[PDB]
Design an enzyme around this catalytic site. Structure first.
Site, PDB file in Angstrom:
ATOM      1  N   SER A   1       0.422   0.477   6.386  1.00 55.39           N
ATOM      2  CA  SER A   1      -0.403   1.292   7.279  1.00 55.39           C
ATOM      3  C   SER A   1      -1.514   0.441   7.890  1.00 55.39           C
ATOM      4  O   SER A   1      -1.879  -0.608   7.348  1.00 55.39           O
ATOM      5  CB  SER A   1      -1.009   2.511   6.556  1.00 55.39           C
ATOM      6  OG  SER A   1      -1.858   2.133   5.474  1.00 55.39           O
TER       7      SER A   1
ATOM      8  N   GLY B   1       0.793  -1.221   0.000  1.00 58.93           N
ATOM      9  CA  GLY B   1       0.000   0.000   0.000  1.00 58.93           C
ATOM     10  C   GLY B   1       0.827   1.274   0.000  1.00 58.93           C
ATOM     11  O   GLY B   1       2.052   1.217   0.022  1.00 58.93           O
TER      12      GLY B   1
ATOM     13  N   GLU C   1      15.565 -13.775  16.760  1.00 58.94           N
ATOM     14  CA  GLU C   1      16.112 -13.127  17.942  1.00 58.94           C
ATOM     15  C   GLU C   1      15.187 -12.034  18.475  1.00 58.94           C
ATOM     16  O   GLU C   1      15.072 -11.867  19.690  1.00 58.94           O
ATOM     17  CB  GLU C   1      17.522 -12.585  17.692  1.00 58.94           C
ATOM     18  CG  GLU C   1      18.627 -13.436  18.303  1.00 58.94           C
ATOM     19  CD  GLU C   1      19.950 -12.695  18.404  1.00 58.94           C
ATOM     20  OE1 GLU C   1      20.700 -12.696  17.413  1.00 58.94           O
ATOM     21  OE2 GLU C   1      20.242 -12.111  19.471  1.00 58.94           O
TER      22      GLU C   1
HETATM   23  N1  LIG Z   1       4.065   7.905   7.796  1.00 64.18           N
HETATM   24  C1  LIG Z   1       3.409   7.765   6.648  1.00 64.18           C
HETATM   25  N2  LIG Z   1       2.060   7.499   6.658  1.00 64.18           N
HETATM   26  C2  LIG Z   1       1.406   7.360   5.486  1.00 64.18           C
HETATM   27  C3  LIG Z   1       2.058   7.479   4.267  1.00 64.18           C
HETATM   28  N3  LIG Z   1       1.138   7.292   3.288  1.00 64.18           N
HETATM   29  C4  LIG Z   1      -0.062   7.056   3.863  1.00 64.18           C
HETATM   30  N4  LIG Z   1       0.094   7.109   5.223  1.00 64.18           N
HETATM   31  C5  LIG Z   1      -0.920   6.892   6.263  1.00 64.18           C
HETATM   32  O1  LIG Z   1      -1.568   5.677   5.952  1.00 64.18           O
HETATM   33  C6  LIG Z   1      -2.960   5.786   6.187  1.00 64.18           C
HETATM   34  C7  LIG Z   1      -3.695   5.649   4.863  1.00 64.18           C
HETATM   35  O2  LIG Z   1      -3.378   4.407   4.281  1.00 64.18           O
HETATM   36  P1  LIG Z   1      -2.634   4.272   2.866  1.00 64.18           P
HETATM   37  O3  LIG Z   1      -1.321   3.523   2.992  1.00 64.18           O
HETATM   38  O4  LIG Z   1      -2.438   5.636   2.262  1.00 64.18           O
HETATM   39  O5  LIG Z   1      -3.739   3.470   2.015  1.00 64.18           O
HETATM   40  P2  LIG Z   1      -3.434   2.122   1.196  1.00 64.18           P
HETATM   41  O6  LIG Z   1      -2.705   1.085   2.035  1.00 64.18           O
HETATM   42  O7  LIG Z   1      -2.643   2.468  -0.031  1.00 64.18           O
HETATM   43  O8  LIG Z   1      -4.881   1.496   0.888  1.00 64.18           O
HETATM   44  P3  LIG Z   1      -5.957   2.125  -0.134  1.00 64.18           P
HETATM   45  O9  LIG Z   1      -5.432   3.409  -0.720  1.00 64.18           O
HETATM   46  O10 LIG Z   1      -7.253   2.319   0.610  1.00 64.18           O
HETATM   47  O11 LIG Z   1      -6.119   1.086  -1.223  1.00 64.18           O
HETATM   48  C8  LIG Z   1      -3.199   7.168   6.758  1.00 64.18           C
HETATM   49  O12 LIG Z   1      -3.153   7.083   8.162  1.00 64.18           O
HETATM   50  C9  LIG Z   1      -2.008   7.948   6.262  1.00 64.18           C
HETATM   51  O13 LIG Z   1      -1.704   9.025   7.118  1.00 64.18           O
HETATM   52  C10 LIG Z   1       3.423   7.743   4.253  1.00 64.18           C
HETATM   53  O14 LIG Z   1       4.048   7.859   3.195  1.00 64.18           O
HETATM   54  N5  LIG Z   1       4.081   7.884   5.452  1.00 64.18           N
END
Ligand SMILES: Nc1nc2c(ncn2[C@@H]2O[C@H](COP(=O)(O)OP(=O)(O)OP(=O)(O)O)[C@@H](O)[C@H]2O)c(=O)[nH]1
Ligand SMILES: C=C1C[C@H](C)C[C@@H]2CC=C[C@@H](C/C=C\C(=O)O[C@H]([C@@H](O)/C=C/[C@@H]3CC(C)=CCO3)C[C@@H]3O[C@H]3[C@@H](O)C1)O2
Ligand SMILES: Nc1ncnc2c1ncn2[C@@H]1O[C@H](COP(=O)(O)OP(=O)(O)CP(=O)(O)O)[C@@H](O)[C@H]1O
Ligand SMILES: Nc1nc2c(ncn2[C@@H]2O[C@H](COP(=O)(O)OP(=O)(O)O)[C@@H](O)[C@H]2O)c(=O)[nH]1
Ligand SMILES: [Ca+2]
Ligand SMILES: [Ca+2]
Ligand SMILES: [Ca+2]
Ligand SMILES: [Mg+2]
Ligand SMILES: [Mg+2]
Ligand SMILES: [Mg+2]
EC number: 3.6.5.-
Lengths: 439, 54, 348, 426
Positions: free
Chosen positions: A140, A10, A254
């Protein structure tokens, strides 16, 4: 030498994965085109770094990684970005349309259609492994892919590789940077289904990282890039022991044996120091005593919570840079008679310590100053259950009205899975209360 | 404090300091889950198409 | 406009604190479960500390220190005092105490018995008192002491009874001193300048411990069991101006010299001891708390700490002044509105 | 997760639709001939969401124009950007619908619907990955209302897993063409409740009032009303049209905005209201966009609560000030946000401002106060229906009274459902 395969699922998992491999390459002296002048055994080796990088006859060093996302936006950044030449096309897997922040959509609906393609690309990597030890899965909690697809992937990984260890780096949801109001649902659903399949999971609360970037890097409104470069430093210090010569945490097993005495209670708190901005010209270098002391400050934790009001089950200090055992034992002596560090009765009060002499590498032009010494503490404290409590509360508020539930049911998920996931978390909260609270 | 298991190499050191002594679903079951969800999706859609047909 | 919520309906102190804030025209009360608050007036039990301080754009504050229960639980207070190097031994202001566990649903006793035996064949008063956090036994025999803890089924503490209290004249009557202490978010320690003596209306006895009305100075008990309640002073309550006059007239000293110096010392020792464990200095939320310290004064004008109350009530006469003080010192300090202080600062 | 297909039906639908395309074409740097002449890549990164790539590297709106007479479409075709539309995408009859829902939905409309569906299919099949459809129409006439909802039903049948989105203009006695508007609107709402995922409620009463007692227009025309609608539509589609991570596709927007499937009727707002020189401060944008006076549905948000809110800030400004102000608006008015959907207000920022403005903000709220709108329509409906007034226009087209009774029952259920969650507490 035993290989480790990293899987990035994701948007969050992919962007963080991209930041980590950038950093890994800097730390091992690998160039964007995949070549390593320092490496002498061309076309193959048994070096510690080979746990994360395989080699081609032409001396290209290739990450043992697969990137999976249900839409191509983010992974396409990789294909065309600075490190395009590093990965092979087979490693990068993209789908047509994403999971729309819906766990059920990512797990059931779209998961079913892509899971065999994913497991197969992984198999190609596993097949180049003389002795694969397991997987590091980045994702995430809040996204539909990150939550729903990951939990299916984990279930199947336990099946196809039942002996292998699986570690998680999970991004716990924070409204400050959040993209969906249903993230609490996705978090609890994925945690429930993943629970039995993860040996050790490092949760990073976006709220903690966001605030650290604001207060310590003087970044007014942190972006994903700021957050991810900070996250990748923490990730690197955690994985550095698998990639470099050493005697502490040299294999994935570990982590469990050192940090996880009770299987469900497998979420160690990471704390990191020092975080210093690369814009501050004059800065005084912190000592072993000071950076170690900073490890017991909530302001520096990957999840805001209060270990003073929990109990420890295990503690590990991972230093990078100019540190010697003498300075560490001295620091720990003073700190112990100064701070509230209560271990559970059925565990020894002590610290496992690792030191790597190479000080942390930072990305050129990044926000992080270079420092001569740094530490990451991994502590398994019951105080982290505060993060479950917050999350479970938000879930309860919405679920009581069945707000947004129809989106999930509409993807073929049964409503009872909500109550099932929530019952599992309630048990989890209870387990933490039992090991950490007196009366 | 007792320092134990002290290990040294060119890259660094590791050791342990003690301050005080102490006092899965099969492949089949998963495909069944995915298939049962898909069937519910198929059923919900068939009801919609029935409704539209009326 | 600052916002706040209310989650303890029985708090007379904060029920008045709330009404004060509304009166400001700059504070709005919200519903119990609305997380959009600046200020929480929490519940006495199982307060969700883990849910505080995660609301973007809100500085949040609560009227309880997480962890303060160590001081305010009778069994816990004894343990904290024995095992804390800051206190522990070489604490001369807490009565000899032991934690005794019932044989029904670590542990002491025996160690207690050894000290007991010393005064037995020592020609010294062995009157002890059993109690826990109605339900108190004052006896001079170890046998019928333990043979009472097990009948109740709760963790108890047996401490030395103060056989030589300072008695007020006329009346030959016992009493205890209540002080109210406010610890703000910066861990400044504020002693309210007004205290109260909870007096007994019955002459103090030495051979009749069955009649627990001249031995227990609780205001709840005094009204119920005393014919003369309110005779000597309203509500069996003497305040500081009167008590000071008494000490000057009767003993040629002052409340400040004979007693308050010790009271301040004890408050500082207890709160500074627990400070590292509960301080919210670098926490994502902040707290303050109002404490009720209860003291006994012996006949030599030596002050003894009896207990610390974490959720104290006040005295009617004083509710007004103190509550404004909480507002000015504890709350407006964090959320300033757009002297002659009622508090003394015990300088940590 | 990519292409959207736009449909515009009837007079109102086609007039607002033409303006919409005029406005976004400008923002994306596309000229009346379909040739790109912009000065940024941000305006082409997601250009494929609304435009097809043609021969000679030019852009053609993925737009289908529908009517039961030819008048308004001739006007569109001879309009400023008339040349930009694909000529094959004009689908029209000659009979008209006589402001009659029954004619649009059951008789005249039935005749033409298959040819529209052919055009929809040709546009879909060209799509790499179709996310869904957006329809512009009014609820008070016959074609947009009756044929519009017929089309939506047929589209759902053929594409049951795509998102259906509408901009629906609600009728007002203040800006009325015929007395049967409440009949047509009520019949349509019934359809919309069951067959759309997101509906932007554009209220002609609000648009009128804004023009009159905010923009100081003594005599607002449909042109003035449409200036407001153009701007709202450009605003609400911004996150779809430019790079960003929040509500960037129809399904993600729907998951964030719609907690219960029937309650998907949104109250749009924007700031600043224009019909300039000093740009608004971020705090001003925020104060204004949430003001009842800036709402395009004539309901007072203070009369209900927000289930969910989406906001979009456009231009160059401090993301820090935006977060701060948005947090301030919620923290100082927390009473009006349901407490059982935590963090229910989301915000996006796009660097590219709209034409003639340095800064602007668009508000999309799912508020229970929208019940006021449906109640207004319900009242006007019942005043006539109790005496079966004007019913013969409908029974003459084969409809019977029972269908009116059912649409009325369903709309009143909708009202009561909003009241429930307005009263609901944690
Ligand atoms: N720290 C950090 N958090 C991220 C990043 N991208 C998305 N998020 C967090 O991840 C959550 C959203 O999920 P995503 O990873 O964007 O969604 P996905 O896994 O791609 O799933 P879908 O888009 O619904 O298909 C939110 O809480 C965002 O703030 C990133 O690059 N860094
Ligand atoms: C400046 C304020 C009130 C306070 C000082 C500002 C506070 C913080 C930030 C924004 C505003 C809310 C924005 C507009 C507003 O309040 O307009 C009012 C009236 O329309 C009330 C609208 C409310 C706003 C909200 C948030 C929910 C329900 O509807 C109409 C009032 O003229 C507007 C002005 O007085 C608004 O609330
Ligand atoms: N060790 C001692 N020596 C002499 N008197 C003592 C004593 N311990 C307790 N008492 C006396 O009798 C009563 C017990 O009151 P205690 O404070 O211990 O419990 P409590 O339930 O009354 C809560 P509070 O502190 O608010 O009064 C003492 O207040 C005082 O009257
Ligand atoms: N905002 C706006 N409303 C319109 C416009 N034209 C018609 N209306 C409204 O739409 C309703 C009439 O429906 P209309 O679109 O003209 O009939 P149709 O061609 O059969 O769909 C009435 O409520 C009018 O007030 C327009 O250009 N702008
Ligand atoms: Ca090699
Ligand atoms: Ca005909
Ligand atoms: Ca045909
Ligand atoms: Mg995604
Ligand atoms: Mg008490
Ligand atoms: Mg018309």
């Amino acid at each position: 030498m035993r290989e480790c395969i990293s899987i990035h699922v994701g948007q969050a998992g992919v962007q963080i994965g991209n930041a980590c491999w950038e950093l890994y390459c800097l730390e091992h002296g690998i160039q964007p085109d995949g070549q390593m002048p320092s490496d002498k055994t061309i076309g193959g080796g048994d070096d510690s770094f080979n746990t994360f990088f395989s080699e081609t006859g032409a001396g290209k060093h290739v990450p043992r990684a697969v990137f999976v996302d249900l839409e191509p936006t983010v992974i396409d950044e990789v294909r065309t970005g600075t490190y395009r030449q590093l990965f092979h096309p087979e490693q990068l897997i993209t789908g047509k349309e994403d999971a729309a922040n819906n766990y059920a959509r990512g797990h059931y609906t779209i998961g079913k259609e892509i899971i065999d393609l994913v497991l197969d690309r992984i198999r190609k990597l596993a097949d180049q492994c003389t002795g694969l030890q397991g997987f590091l899965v980045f994702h995430s909690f809040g996204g539909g892919t990150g939550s729903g697809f990951t939990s299916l992937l984990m279930e199947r990984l336990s099946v196809d590789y039942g002996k292998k260890s699986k570690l998680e780096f999970s991004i716990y949801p924070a409204p400050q940077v959040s993209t969906a109001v249903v993230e609490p649902y996705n978090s609890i659903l994925t945690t429930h289904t993943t629970l039995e399949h993860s040996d050790c999971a490092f949760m990073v609360d976006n709220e903690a990282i966001y605030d650290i970037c604001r207060r310590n890097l003087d970044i007014e409104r942190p972006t994903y890039t700021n957050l991810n470069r900070l996250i990748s430093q923490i990730v690197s210090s955690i994985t550095a022991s698998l990639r470099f010569d050493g005697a502490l945490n040299v294999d994935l097993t570990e982590f469990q044996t050192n940090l996880v005495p009770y299987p469900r209670i497998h979420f160690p708190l990471a704390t990191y120091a020092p975080v210093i901005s690369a814009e501050k010209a004059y800065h005084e270098q912190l000592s072993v005593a000071e950076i170690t002391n900073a490890c017991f400050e909530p302001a520096n934790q990957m999840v805001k919570c209060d270990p003073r009001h929990g109990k420890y089950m295990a503690c590990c200090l991972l230093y990078r840079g100019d540190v010697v055992p003498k300075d560490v034992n001295a620091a720990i002596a003073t700190i112990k008679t100064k701070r509230s560090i209560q271990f559970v009765d059925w565990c020894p009060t002590g610290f496992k310590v690792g030191i790597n002499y190479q000080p942390p590498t930072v990305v050129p032009g990044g926000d992080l100053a270079k420092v001569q010494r740094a530490v990451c503490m991994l502590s398994n404290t019951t105080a982290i259950a505060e993060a479950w409590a917050r999350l479970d509360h938000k879930f309860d508020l919405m679920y009581a009205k069945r707000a947004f539930v129809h989106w999930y049911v509409g993807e073929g998920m049964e409503e009872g899975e909500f109550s099932e996931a929530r019952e599992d978390m309630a048990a989890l909260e209870k387990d933490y209360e039992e090991v950490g609270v007196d009366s | 404090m007792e320092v134990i298991e002290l290990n040294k190499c060119t890259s660094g050191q590791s050791f342990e300091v003690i301050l005080k002594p102490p006092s899965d679903p099969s492949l089949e079951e998963i495909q069944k889950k995915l298939e049962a969800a898909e069937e519910r999706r198929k059923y919900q859609e068939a009801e919609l198409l029935k409704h539209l047909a009326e | 406009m600052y916002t706040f919520v209310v989650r303890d309906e029985n708090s007379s102190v904060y029920a008045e604190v709330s009404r004060l804030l509304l009166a400001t025209g700059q504070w709005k009360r919200l519903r119990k479960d609305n997380p959009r608050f600046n200020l929480m007036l929490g519940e006495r039990n199982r307060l969700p500390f883990g849910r505080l301080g995660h609301e973007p754009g809100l500085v949040q504050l609560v009227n309880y220190y997480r962890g303060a229960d160590k001081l305010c639980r009778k069994a816990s207070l004894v343990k904290l005092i024995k095992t804390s190097p800051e206190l522990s031994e070489s604490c001369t202001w807490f009565p000899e105490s032991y934690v005794i566990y019932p044989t029904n649903l670590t542990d002491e006793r025996e160690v207690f018995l050894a000290a007991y035996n010393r005064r037995r064949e020592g020609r010294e008063g062995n009157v002890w008192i059993a109690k826990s956090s109605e339900g108190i036994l004052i006896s001079s025999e170890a046998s019928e002491l333990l043979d009472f803890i097990d009948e109740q089924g709760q963790v108890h503490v047996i401490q030395k009874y103060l056989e030589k209290p300072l008695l007020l004249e006329p009346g030959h009557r016992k009493f205890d001193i209540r002080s109210w202490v406010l610890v703000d978010h910066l861990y400044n320690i504020y002693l309210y300048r007004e205290g109260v003596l909870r007096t007994s209306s019955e002459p103090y006895n030495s051979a009749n411990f069955q009649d627990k009305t001249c031995h227990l100075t609780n205001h709840c008990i005094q009204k119920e069991y005393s014919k003369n309640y309110g005779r000597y002073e309203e509500g069996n309550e003497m305040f500081f101006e009167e008590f000071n006059q008494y000490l000057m007239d009767a003993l040629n000293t002052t409340l400040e010299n004979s007693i308050l110096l010790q009271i301040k010392h004890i408050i500082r020792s207890c709160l500074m001891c627990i400070e590292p464990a509960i301080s919210t200095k670098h926490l994502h939320y902040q707290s303050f708390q109002l404490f009720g310290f209860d003291f006994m004064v012996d006949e030599e004008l030596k002050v003894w700490l009896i207990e610390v109350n974490g959720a104290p009530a006040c005295a009617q006469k004083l509710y007004a002044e103190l509550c404004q003080g909480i507002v000015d010192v504890a709350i407006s300090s964090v959320f300033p509105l757009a002297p002659t202080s009622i508090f003394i600062k015990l300088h940590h | 997760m990519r292409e959207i297909v736009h449909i515009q039906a009837g007079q109102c639908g086609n007039q607002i639709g033409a303006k919409f395309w005029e406005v976004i074409s400008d923002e994306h740097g596309i000229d009346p001939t379909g040739s790109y002449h912009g000065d940024s890549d941000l305006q082409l990164e997601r250009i494929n969401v609304y435009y097809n790539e043609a021969t000679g590297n030019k852009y053609v709106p993925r737009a289908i124009l529908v009517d039961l007479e030819p008048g308004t479409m001739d006007s569109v075709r001879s309009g400023p950007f008339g040349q930009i539309f694909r000529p094959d995408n004009f689908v029209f009859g000659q009979s008209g619908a006589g402001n009659n829902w029954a004619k649009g939905h059951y008789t005249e409309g039935a005749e033409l619907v298959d040819s529209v569906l052919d055009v929809v299919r040709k546009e879909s099949e060209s799509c790499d990955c179709l996310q869904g459809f957006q329809l512009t129409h009014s609820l008070g006439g016959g074609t947009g209302s009756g044929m519009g909802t017929l089309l939506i039903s047929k589209i759902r049948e053929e594409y049951p897993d795509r998102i259906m989105n509408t901009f629906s203009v609600m009728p007002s006695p203040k800006v009325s063409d015929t007395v049967v508007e409440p009949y047509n609107a009520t019949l349509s709402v019934h359809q919309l409740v069951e067959n759309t995922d997101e509906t932007y409620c554009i209220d002609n009463e609000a648009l009128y009032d804004i023009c009159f007692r905010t923009l100081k227009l003594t005599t607002p025309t449909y042109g003035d009303l449409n200036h407001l609608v153009s701007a709202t539509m450009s605003g609400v589609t911004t996150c779809l049209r430019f790079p960003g991570q929040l509500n960037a596709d129809l399904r993600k927007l729907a998951v964030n905005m719609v907690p219960f499937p029937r309650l998907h009727f949104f109250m749009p707002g924007f700031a600043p209201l224009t019909s300039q020189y000093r740009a608004l401060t971020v705090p001003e944008l925020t104060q204004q966009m949430f003001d009842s006076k800036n709402m395009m549905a004539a309901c007072d948000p203070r009369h209900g609560r927000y289930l969910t809110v989406a906001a979009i800030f456009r231009g160059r400004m401090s993301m820090k000030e935006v977060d701060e102000q948005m947090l301030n608006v919620q923290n100082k008015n927390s009473s009006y946000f349901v407490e059982w959907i935590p963090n229910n207000v989301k915000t996006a920022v796009c660097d590219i401002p709209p034409r003639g403005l340095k800064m602007s903000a668009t508000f999309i709220g799912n508020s229970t106060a929208i019940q006021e709108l449906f109640k207004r329509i319900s009242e006007q409906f019942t005043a006539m229906f109790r005496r079966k007034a004007f019913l013969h226009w409908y029974t003459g087209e084969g409809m019977d009274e029972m269908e009116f009774t059912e649409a009325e029952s369903n709309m009143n259920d909708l009202v009561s459902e909003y009241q429930q969650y307005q009263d609901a507490t944690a």
